[PDB]
Amino acid sequence: DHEAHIKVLRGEPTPEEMAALMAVLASAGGGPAEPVKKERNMWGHPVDKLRYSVFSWQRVTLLERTHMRR
Amino acid sequence: IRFCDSYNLPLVFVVDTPGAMPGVAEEKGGIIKRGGRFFNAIVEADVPKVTVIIRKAYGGGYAVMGSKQLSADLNFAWPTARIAVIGAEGAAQLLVKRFPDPNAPEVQKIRDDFIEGYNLNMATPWIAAERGYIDAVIQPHETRLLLRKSLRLLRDKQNGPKVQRKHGLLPL
Amino acid sequence: IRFCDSYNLPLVFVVDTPGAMPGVAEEKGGIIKRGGRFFNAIVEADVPKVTVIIRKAYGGGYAVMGSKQLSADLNFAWPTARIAVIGAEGAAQLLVKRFPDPNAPEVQKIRDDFIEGYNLNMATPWIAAERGYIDAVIQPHETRLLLRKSLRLLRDKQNGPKVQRKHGLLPL
Structure with missing residues (x-):
């Protein structure tokens, strides 16, 4: 067991106060956890709009890396 | 260094060195070319470079261990x-070898007073700080969080201008 | 090789070698990494690579001196x-490591017969030629004009597929 739990550091609520608290906190939860449906779409990415010198090293370290990083 | 650069790992240099090892066996073992490759690798690399000097940074040890002049960032x-x-x-020996002999404690005193003056005025943080060869002199307890701040700033470093070509040439 | 590749000179390899020099002094001197760097450089180079074997090409000498397997072109x-x-x-010596009685006349006869057979059937051009590890066996007088024809063909060599990246790593 290595999840970080909610801790009541001070105070001792009754079961009904604990239930009210946890229901409120869960309603205040951040919604869906993360946007797992996010999809890669590199069309018109800003790095493709830059002018690069034909001998520019940023062709390797900026342009190519941005296209290839996954 | 070359491996870390290929895999985009930032470099942290923790310096406390008198520099290259002197001696005939080191010369014959190729200390010039190996130090040359060390200098080459550190300038070649594109990753963030941050340096913390603890005590000694003499000569080539200063230069090679992520000095600003060799393109270290912070x-x-x-x-x-x-x-x-x-x-x-070493500076004291360079001085006193000009006297005919250590013929009296006069020469000892001359050495000791030179060494005191040199460790107070020359071999210090403060000249390099005045000239901006180093970006800051810090209290040691700051180091961990300062490294966090620095490498957050440097996260997206783009190293240039550099001319793309087949490759650079190492001293080999 | 790295210099020549950097300045686009074709490479001509002229081979007569038993391979790496054996011994404790060479091993301690770094022969493994130095050979590794020779291999690395020869494969890294994009320039035209042409090889002529004169006599010996044993082991790593064969491999490193512009073998076709290490991307030589002709x-x-x-x-x-x-x-x-x-x-x-060397083949006879390990042959004689087993049933070792090196003082006997018969084992010297066996060595002589083995060496004769080996230099007739094994250590020749012909197995490599029949497998296509080398492109041709030539009369020695052809060499100059054949080098001209070959390097004329290879003049516009494009080496690929290669994945562009910061650099290649080498034994160092």
Whole structure:
């Protein structure tokens, strides 16, 4: 067991106060956890709009890396 | 260094060195070319480079261990840092070999007073700080969080201008 | 090789070698990494690579001196070429490591017969030629004009597929 739990550091609520608290906190939860449906779409990415010198090293370290990083 | 650069790992240099090892066996073992490759690798690399000097940074040790002049990005020193071309003892020998002999404690006194003056005025953080060869002299307890701040800033470093070509040439 | 590749000079390899020099002094001197760097450089180079074997090409000498397997472009051999994993005497020596009685006349007869057979059937141009490890066996007088024709063909060589990246790493 290595999840970080909610801790009541001070105070001792009754079961009904604990239930009210946890229901409120869960309603205040951040919604869906993360946007797992996010999809890669590199069309018109800003790095493709830059002018690069034909001998520019940023062709390797900026342009190519941005296209290839996954 | 070359491996870390290929895999985009930032480099942290923690410096406390008199520099290259002197001696005939080191010369014959190729210390010039191996130090050359060390200098080459550190300038070649594109990753963020941050340096913390703890005591000694003499000569080639200063230069190679992520000095700003060799393209390190951020340079910090603890107040114990000593940045110089040569240590006090080496400069003292260079001085006193001009006297005919250590013929009396006169020469000892001359050495000791030179060494005191040199460790107070030369081999210090403060000249390099005045000139901006190092970006800051810091209290040692700052180091961990300062490295966090620095490498957050440097996260997206783009190294240039550099001319793309087949490759650079190492001293080999 | 790295310099020549950097300045686009074609490479001509002219081979007559038993391979790496054996011994404790060479091993301690770094022969493994230095050979590794020779291999690395020869494969890294994009320039045209042409090879002529004159006599011996044993082991790593064969491999490193512009073998086709290490991406040499055209490979020729004189009829005196001898391409093998080990020379006849080294093969005979391990032969005689078993049933070792090296003082007897009969084992010296066995060595002589083995060396004769090996230099007739194994350490030759012909196995490599029949497998296509080399592109041709040539009369020695052809070499100059054949080098001209070959490097004219290879003049516009494009080496690929290669994945562009910061750099290649090498044993260092």
